[PDB]
Design a protein around this ligand. Structure first.
Ligand SMILES: Nc1nc2c(ncn2[C@@H]2O[C@H](COP(=O)(O)OP(=O)(O)NP(=O)(O)O)[C@@H](O)[C@H]2O)c(=O)[nH]1
Ligand SMILES: Nc1nc2c(ncn2[C@@H]2O[C@H](COP(=O)(O)OP(=O)(O)NP(=O)(O)O)[C@@H](O)[C@H]2O)c(=O)[nH]1
Ligand SMILES: [Mg+2]
Ligand SMILES: [Mg+2]
Lengths: 294, 289
C-alpha cells in the first residue's frame, strides 16, 4: 500500500486522479478538498491499494490509529508543494518518519518535490540537492542519519509524475529482481536495447532493464502506447505496433497479461528488420511465459 | 503557379499566429502562449508537397495595423491573393466590428483578386460549452455567409476551430488542399492503389505538416485525428533524434513515406494477410505509380 500525504493543497489528490483515473491535468487546478481517508484501488496485478490521508493534524501525531495503519503500509509517499511553504513540511516529514520507522523498519520513505512546473532548470537543482539537506538535518536530530530517503521531481503536467510513481511502485513489487533480470539480459540475447513493462491505462513502468533509465526512453515508449491506442481505437472491428525511424531504430510494443504491455527500443546496428523482429519475438515469447507464471 | 499568397487576417488575439505555429512550426498548443503580437504582416514561405510554396501573410490584427491594410497598403495586401482565411475570436467583444473588417477585406478582394478563395474560422471554440457550440456556429455562419455572398463570393466555407482539438487540422487540410494542382491525378492513383491492396481505406498525408491530401473513400473525424496523432508522434520521435519512417499496427494498419513529400495511411479489410505480400505492393505504388 502506498500512503499519500502532505499538507493541504500540495498535490496529493490531483496526482492521485491524474494517474489512476487517467484524468487530464487541467481539470485539477480547481478540484475541491478530499478530507475523508479515501482508499482507492488500481490494479497493477497483484492489486495495489492507495490511500491518501488528509494533510494536517499538527505533526502526525502518535496514536493507536497512527501505528495501526503503518503496520500495513509498504511505502510512504510524502508529497511536498513548492509554490511556497518549503520549510515546515520538512519537519512534518521528519517526525512522520520517526514513528513510522519504529512501526515498519522495512518502510520506504519516498518524497515528491512536487509542483515543479514552469520553474527553470537551475531553480530545480536549487530546491532539490539541498532541500534533501534540510531533511537530513532534522534527521540528524532525534533519530539517525542513515535512512531510506528518495527525492523525485513530480509535476502532474510533466512525464515525471509517472517516472517517479514507477521507480516507487516498482520497489513494492514481489520479485523486482527477477522481473528486471529476466527482462535485462534475458532480453539481451537480442537486438533490443531497452525494455519497459507498462500498465497501459496508467503509464507507470512496472519494470525496466538494469540499465538506469533516462526519461527520454521512458517518454517515447509511453507516448508510443498512446499513438498505438488512439489509432487502434479509430478503427475497431495482436495488440502490437512496430515502427521504424529513418536511422533504423525500431520501437516495438506487444501486449501482455491484463492491460500490461512490453515496449522496447530495438537497435539493428545493421541487420534487416524482419530478422530483428524474429529474434526479438522469440525471446519476448519467453519473457511472456515468464509472466504468465505469476 | 506553385507560389500561393494566402492572407491570414483577423482581429488581434483571435489566435492567427497560434495556428501558423501549430500546423507549420511544430509548436504544441501550450507553446503558443509566448507568441507575441504580430507587428504589421509577418511573412512565411512554407514549402508544401515538395514543390509548392505557400507564402502565409500573417497580418497583425491590432487596429493600428488594421486600418493600414485597408487604406495605405490596400493594393499591396490585396493584389494576387489566392486565399483569404479570416479568423473570428468567439469570445470576441465586438462581433459586429469583426464582421465589419471581414467586409472591409472582402471588399478589396473584390476589385483586386475577384477569384480568391474565402474560408472563415470560428476560432477558440473550446471556450464554449458543447450544448451551445453548434448554435454559436450556425448563427455566426448565417451572418458571414451573407456578408460574403454580398461581395460576389459565397457559397462560403467555415470551420469550428480550436487549438485544443483536431479541428485545426480539418480546417487547414481543407484550406491548403484547394491549392494542390495535381489533385485529379493524386486522387486517381490513390484509387488504383486502394483497389490493388483490397484496402478498407487509404488516406494520403503531406509528409511534413501532415495535412490530409485526399482520401480513398466510420468516425467522420478520423482524418484530422490521424493528422493529430501522427503529428504528436512525429514530435515524440524527436526524443530519439530520427524521423518516423514506417509504422504497422496489428496486421491491419500500415503507414509509410511515399515520396519525401507524402505519407500513406493504409487500413486493410481484415488482419490475416502476412507482411510479405502487403509490404511488397507499397513499393510501387511509391514515387512512380
Ligand atoms: N502548478 C501546479 N499545481 C499543481 C500541481 N499538482 C497540483 N496542483 C494544484 O494544487 C492545488 C491543490 O491540489 P490537491 O491535490 O487537490 O490538493 P490536496 O493535497 O488534495 N488537498 P487536500 O489535503 O485537501 O486533499 C490545485 O490548485 C492544483 O491545481 C502541479 O504539479 N503543478
Ligand atoms: N483557449 C484557446 N486559446 C487559444 C486558441 N488559439 C489561440 N489561443 C491563445 O490565444 C492567444 C492569442 O495569441 P495569438 O495566437 O498570437 O493571436 P493573434 O491573432 O496572433 N494576435 P495578433 O493578431 O495581434 O498577432 C494566445 O494566448 C494563444 O495561446 C484556442 O483555440 N483556444
Ligand atoms: Mg484531495
Ligand atoms: Mg499574431
Amino acid at each position: 500500500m502506498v500512503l499519500l500525504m502532505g499538507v493541504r493543497r500540495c498535490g496529493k489528490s490531483s496526482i492521485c486522479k491524474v494517474v489512476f483515473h487517467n484524468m487530464q491535468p487541467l481539470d485539477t487546478l480547481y478540484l475541491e478538498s478530499t478530507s475523508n481517508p479515501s482508499l482507492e484501488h488500481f490494479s497493477t496485478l497483484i492489486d495495489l491499494a492507495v490511500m491518501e490521508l488528509p494533510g494536517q493534524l499538527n505533526y502526525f501525531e502518535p496514536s493507536y490509529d497512527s501505528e495501526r495503519l503503518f503496520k500495513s503500509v509498504g511505502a510512504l509517499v510524502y508529497v511536498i508543494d513548492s509554490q511556497d511553504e518549503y520549510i515546515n513540511a520538512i519537519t512534518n516529514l521528519a517526525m512522520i518518519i520517526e514513528y513510522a520507522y519504529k512501526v515498519n523498519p522495512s518502510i520506504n520513505i519516498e518524497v515528491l518535490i512536487h509542483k515543479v512546473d514552469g520553474l527553470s532548470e537551475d531553480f530545480k537543482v536549487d530546491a532539490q540537492r539541498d532541500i534533501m539537506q534540510r531533511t537530513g538535518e532534522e534527521l540528524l536530530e532525534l533519530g539517525l542519519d542513515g535512512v531510506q530517503v528518495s527525492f523525485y521531481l513530480t509535476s502532474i503536467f510533466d512525464h515525471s509524475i509517472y517516472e517517479a510513481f514507477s521507480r516507487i511502485v516498482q520497489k513494492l513489487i514481489p520479485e523486482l529482481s527477477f522481473l528486471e533480470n529476466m527482462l535485462d539480459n534475458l532480453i539481451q540475447h537480442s537486438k533490443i536495447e531497452k525494455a519497459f513493462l507498462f500498465d497501459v491505462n496508467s503509464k507507470i513502468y512496472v519494470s525496466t532493464d538494469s540499465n538506469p533509465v533516462d526519461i527520454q526512453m521512458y517518454e517515447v515508449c509511453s507516448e508510443f502506447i498512446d499513438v498505438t491506442i488512439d489509432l487502434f481505437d479509430l478503427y475497431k472491428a495482436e495488440l502490437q505496433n512496430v515502427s521504424q525511424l529513418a536511422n533504423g531504430v525500431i520501437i516495438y510494443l506487444r501486449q501482455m497479461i491484463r492491460g500490461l504491455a512490453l515496449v522496447a527500443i530495438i537497435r539493428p546496428n545493421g541487420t534487416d528488420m524482419e530478422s530483428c523482429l524474429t529474434v526479438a519475438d522469440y525471446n519476448i515469447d519467453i519473457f511472456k511465459k515468464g509472466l504468465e507464471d505469476i | 503557379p506553385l507560389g500561393s499568397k494566402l492572407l491570414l487576417m483577423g482581429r488581434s488575439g483571435s489566435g492567427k499566429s497560434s495556428m501558423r505555429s501549430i500546423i507549420f512550426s511544430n509548436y504544441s498548443a501550450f507553446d503558443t502562449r509566448r507568441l507575441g503580437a504580430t507587428i504589421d504582416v509577418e511573412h512565411s514561405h512554407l514549402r508544401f508537397l515538395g514543390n509548392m510554396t505557400l507564402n502565409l501573410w500573417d497580418c497583425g490584427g491590432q487596429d493600428v495595423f488594421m486600418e493600414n491594410y485597408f487604406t495605405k497598403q490596400k493594393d499591396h495586401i490585396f493584389q494576387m491573393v489566392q486565399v483569404l482565411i479570416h479568423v473570428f475570436d468567439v469570445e470576441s467583444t465586438e462581433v459586429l466590428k469583426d464582421i465589419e473588417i471581414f467586409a472591409k477585406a472582402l471588399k478589396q478582394l473584390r476589385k483586386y483578386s475577384p477569384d480568391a478563395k474565402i474560408f472563415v474560422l470560428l476560432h477558440k471554440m473550446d471556450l464554449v460549452q458543447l450544448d451551445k457550440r453548434e448554435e454559436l456556429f450556425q448563427i455566426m455562419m448565417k451572418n458571414l455567409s451573407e456578408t460574403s455572398s454580398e461581395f460576389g463570393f459565397p457559397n462560403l466555407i467555415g470551420f469550428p476551430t480550436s487549438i485544443w482539438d483536431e479541428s485545426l487540422y480539418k480546417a487547414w487540410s481543407q484550406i491548403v488542399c484547394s491549392l494542390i494542382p495535381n489533385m485529379s491525378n493524386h486522387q486517381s492513383n490513390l484509387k488504383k492503389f486502394k483497389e490493388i491492396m483490397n484496402a478498407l481505406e487509404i488516406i494520403l498525408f503531406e509528409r511534413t505538416t501532415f495535412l490530409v491530401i485526399c482520401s480513398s473513400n466510420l468516425d467522420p473525424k478520423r482524418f484530422e485525428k490521424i493528422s493529430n496523432i501522427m503529428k504528436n508522434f512525429k514530435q515524440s520521435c524527436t526524443k530519439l533524434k530520427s524521423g518516423f519512417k514506417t509504422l504497422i499496427l496489428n496486421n491491419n494498419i500500415y503507414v509509410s513515406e511515399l515520396s519525401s513529400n507524402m505519407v500513406c495511411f493504409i487500413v486493410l479489410k481484415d488482419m490475416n494477410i502476412p507482411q510479405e505480400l502487403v509490404l511488397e505492393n507499397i513499393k510501387k505504388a511509391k514515387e512512380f505509380f
